[PDB]
Amino acid sequence: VSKQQYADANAAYLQSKAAVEQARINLRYTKVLSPISGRIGRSAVTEGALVTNGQANAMATVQQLDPIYVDVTQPSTALLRLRRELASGQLERAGDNAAKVSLKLEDGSQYPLEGRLEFSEVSVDEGTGSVTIRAVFPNPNNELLPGMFVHAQLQEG
Amino acid sequence: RLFKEGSDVKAGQQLYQIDPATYEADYQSAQANLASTQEQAQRYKLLVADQAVSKQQYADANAAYLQSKAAVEQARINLRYTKVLSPISGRIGRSAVTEGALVT
Amino acid sequence: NGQANAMATVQQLDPIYVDVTQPSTALLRLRRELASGQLERAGDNAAKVSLKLEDGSQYPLEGRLEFSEVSVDEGTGSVTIRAVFPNPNNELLPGMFVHAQLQEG
Numbered sequence: 369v370s371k372q373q374y375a376d377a378n379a380a381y382l383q384s385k386a387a388v389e390q391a392r393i394n395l396r397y398t399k400v401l402s403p404i405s406g407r408i409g410r411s412a413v414t415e416g417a418l419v420t421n422g423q424a425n426a427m428a429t430v431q432q433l434d435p436i437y438v439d440v441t442q443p444s445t446a447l448l449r450l451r452r453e454l455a456s457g458q459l460e461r462a463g464d465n466a467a468k469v470s471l472k473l474e475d476g477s478q479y480p481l482e483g484r485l486e487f488s489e490v491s492v493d494e495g496t497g498s499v500t501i502r503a504v505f506p507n508p509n510n511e512l513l514p515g516m517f518v519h520a521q522l523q524e525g
Numbered sequence: 526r527l528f529k530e531g532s533d534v535k536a537g538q539q540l541y542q543i544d545p546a547t548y549e550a551d552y553q554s555a556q557a558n559l560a561s562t563q564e565q566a567q568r569y570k571l572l573v574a575d576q577a578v579s580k581q582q583y584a585d586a587n588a589a590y591l592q593s594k595a596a597v598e599q600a601r602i603n604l605r606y607t608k609v610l611s612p613i614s615g616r617i618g619r620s621a622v623t624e625g626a627l628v629t
Numbered sequence: 630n631g632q633a634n635a636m637a638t639v640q641q642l643d644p645i646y647v648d649v650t651q652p653s654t655a656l657l658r659l660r661r662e663l664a665s666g667q668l669e670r671a672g673d674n675a676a677k678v679s680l681k682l683e684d685g686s687q688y689p690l691e692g693r694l695e696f697s698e699v700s701v702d703e704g705t706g707s708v709t710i711r712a713v714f715p716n717p718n719n720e721l722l723p724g725m726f727v728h729a730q731l732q733e734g
Contacts, residue, residue, distance in 0.1 A: 372565055379561035386554035393547055403625035410697035410711060416639065420631050422629050430625065431700070474654050474706075488531035488619040502530070502619065511660070513708070515701040516653060 406432040431514060436507040438471060438483065440520045441498040450524055460525030469503045472519040481506050485522070526624055534617045541609040543628060548607055552600040559593040566590035640723060645716045647680065647692065649729045650707045662734050669734040677712055681728040682721075690715050692729075 402408070409429045413419065419427065454460050467484040483505030492499055503520060505512065512518075528540045569583040611617070622628070662668050669675050680688040698709035712729060714721065721727075 372568060375564050376561045379557045382557035383554050386550045386557065389550045389553075390547065393550070403627075407699055409700065410709075418631070422627065429700075433699070473657065475658065477657075486529075486531055490531070490616055491618065500619070510699070511657070513653065513699055513701050515703060517706065 400427075402430055404430055404432065406430045433510050433512075433514070434507045435483075436505050436512045436514065438469070438503040438505055438518060438520055440485075440501045440503065440522075441496065442501060443496075443498045444492045445497075447499060454525060462525055463523060466523055468523065469505075470521050471503075471505065472521065474517060479505070479511070479518075481508075485520075526620055528617055528620075530617065530619055532617060534611045534614060536611055536614045538611045539608045540611055540617070543607045543609065545604060545607045548600065548603045552597070552604050555593070555597045555600040559597045562586070562590045562593045642719050642721075642723075643716045645714050645721050645723070647712045647714055647727060647729055649710050649712070649727075649731075650705075651710055653701045653706050653708050656708065659733060666734060669732075671732060671734070675732045675734075678730045678732055680714065681730065683725055683727065688714070688720070694731075 407430070409431070411428050412425065413427050450460075454462065468482060469485050470482050471479045473479060483503050485501055485503035488502040489500035501522075526541055528534055528538070534540070566583075566587045566589075569578050569586045572578040573580060573583040677692045677694040679691050682688060692712045692714040694710070694712050697711040701708050710731075
């Protein structure tokens, strides 16, 4: 055979192998593999329900509980006056352990471990007038659950 | 998720990865056709000098060559969409989704 | 094809699930069993106890506990707790408002 005949026969073979892989992907989707590793909740749908590709309502949730985030709201007037009296007027001398955050639970009991914060939302909400800060806490015993109301005690200079 | 939250991102910086796995197979199926018709276009460009192949045969060969090159360019932009490049430069906020969510 | 509203609905009545709500301000208090009271030293008896129907009568059979929801809600601050109950004579129906008794330590 000519070399170009081997070339486009090999190309037809590679195209059909790619189509086989395209079918194998959809065959892999019918066994719903979990995307991450974590604690799974309860099933929103049971055996017999009909699902649809890319539907909005979920069927289950998987969550990782270690570490945990703490989202914190602070009003923008307080941040404005802190930014004012940090440099202008007396210097409040921001400090070295400005990362350290300790939280309190609903019953006033202290969380034994401590976490650190990083900023993640430079925007003022139009409904509440408050910026949002985010801290990361270690959660080795699952004492903190996603959604709980806590009190983060920061260090404003 | 390949960005630190609350940081400065530049234009064109990759922020995510959306599991190509289908666009990879589309890219392979396009490049298999490109690697075939490009060789025929070059061979007919060599043969058309000393008239072993008519001019219309070469003008139909390089047209299919350019069509397969456009198909590979169509596969490459879908492969570039799976790495979500930052459209502008600025401050990125909190990620509304985490690793494991299904997008559309 | 794939419309939202259903044509009919089929249901299995045996067994049956009971989803109760516990305030999350109570289970972290229950996690303070090391000082006040003592720990859940009940073994398999800490699985489950019975259920109270709508009219205040007692269900004759007992159930079994499997936890399924480690997530509190923002509105009421409560955790969802699931239990399973045998239903041989279709006394319990899906949707009734019941009061499940549980086991602390």
